[PDB]
Amino acid sequence: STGSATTTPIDSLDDAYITPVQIGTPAQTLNLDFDTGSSDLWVFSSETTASEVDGQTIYTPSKSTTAKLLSGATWSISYGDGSSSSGDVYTDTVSVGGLTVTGQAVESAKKVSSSFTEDSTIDGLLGLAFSTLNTVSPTQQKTFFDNAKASLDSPVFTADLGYHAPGTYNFGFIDTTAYTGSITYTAVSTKQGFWEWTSTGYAVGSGTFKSTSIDGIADTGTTLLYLPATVVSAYWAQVSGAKSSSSVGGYVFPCSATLPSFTFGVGSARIVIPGDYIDFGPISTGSSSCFGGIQSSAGIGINIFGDVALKAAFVVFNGATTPTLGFASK
């Protein structure tokens, strides 16, 4: 089997992407944030504290003939940005882009933090990291991908995120029309439960390539590119007036600037992030200070190849017995 679903930016900044997902019988379609940096499929629901729901579409398990309470199971997750959610668990039928999993754990939120409430466009998350990170207790549950894997034509999914435009998540096949040149594959460590890999270096604008190993994660659920302070300083030094602002919470730059590109290495291959992809616009409405899309990972504890990086590539998440990651230009 295969699946193919369009993913759409939630706003004009590409802060996140939503993909429609069918849950239950008859189908209830919720727009979920596919997150290769976590491993829980959770939704706003009829059980979510009413004051914490503000415009989201909810899953109502009582209206699904295929929903079953997973008795005794609870979940609770905290994300890198400090947001969180928790609740109980149902199993139900879940379909993405025509690919159906029966018996998928659907984690029903009883509580969500303010960041989730305030984002009316995101009805929940669909985790695509390794199932070892799943938070369901006392019986850990599998991700949608892990459940689907055996049925897939090939044990892969691909992320093709757009810049200020829709893109695609495919399951079970590689669309050879969706990228240019060849796909370069690179080793993955699953030791921390992430799609963790080592970039071979970087360049700033038209500058020379610096060969240096940068360990990080491919994370569709993180907006920006978080890299070591040395690398980030080298980038922003090429933008007149750019500075790190503790009051704002990272590097800002004059909105009048033209940003240089940023290149990262995948083996001997190179992925170029255009400068425009690094512009996250005014820090506050009407400001002439703009927020940068490349930020320091210092104090996160891990480098993160988030959407800023991934949307410059066609990315293969290869879940074969020895997982790997593939990157192609597009």
Swiss-Prot record:
Alphabetized UniProt keyword annotations: Aspartyl protease, Disulfide bond, Hydrolase, Protease, Signal, Zymogen
Superkingdom in the source lineage: Eukaryota
Entry annotation: catalytic residues: 35, 199
EC number: 3.4.23.22
Annotated Peptidase A1 domain residues: 17-328
MF terms (GO), sorted A to Z: aspartic-type endopeptidase activity
GO biological processes: proteolysis
Keyword Signal belongs to the record: yes
Catalytic activity: Hydrolysis of proteins with specificity similar to that of pepsin A, prefers hydrophobic residues at P1 and P1', but does not cleave 14-Ala-|-Leu-15 in the B chain of insulin or Z-Glu-Tyr. Clots milk
Disulphide-bridged cysteine pairs: 255-290
Keyword tRNA processing: no
UniProt family annotation: Belongs to the peptidase A1 family.
Protein name as annotated: Endothiapepsin
Species of the source: Cryphonectria parasitica (Chestnut blight fungus)
Gene: EAPA
Entire-sequence positions represented here: 90 to 419 of 419
